[PDB]
Design a protein around this ligand. Sequence first.
Ligand code: HEM
Length: 153
Amino acid sequence: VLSEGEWQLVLHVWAKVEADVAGHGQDILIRLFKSHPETLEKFDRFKHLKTEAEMKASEDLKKHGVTVLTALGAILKKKGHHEAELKPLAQSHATKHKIPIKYLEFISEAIIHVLHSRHPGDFGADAQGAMNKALELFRKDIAAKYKELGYQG
Ligand code: HEM
């Protein structure tokens, strides 16, 4: 479990992310899609996007970057008591979207890269450590729901 001090580091940076959810959403999805091109194939709606310039220009991409960070922030702010928030998500990502756990590991690294590039002073090594723990917690709970449904992985 994260301590109360680790939760404070997490949410302190997250309140900065919430200053500009759309720009953060953008960076994180584009980092995901460039670093791990196989992830872009899961999105029928982004499949046509072939360059970084085209991704930066898509309003739909930026809109759905807000969708992802908003659902994430709702989870983070439950400081581990996230059962009602996480359940629906795992269900649709296991059974409808078919997203393996490993991809949730990729987007975790993209989130951490982008926080570091945008918020140095609030994202030192202690906060990086705390955010990695929170992201591991979220992955571990999702993985348990996956296993139950027959998708573990
Ligand atoms: C930090 C984790 C992520 C969160 C919080 C998250 C959240 C969301 C939300 C809230 C929706 C819409 C409602 C739903 O369908 O249940 C959604 C849709 C979707 N998510 Fe995610 N997601 C995340 C990670 C991923 C990743 C890593 C991928 C793919 C590599 C993925 C693929 C999808 C797809 C394919 C859809 C449907 C888009 C559409 O309707 O065209 N998700 N996700």
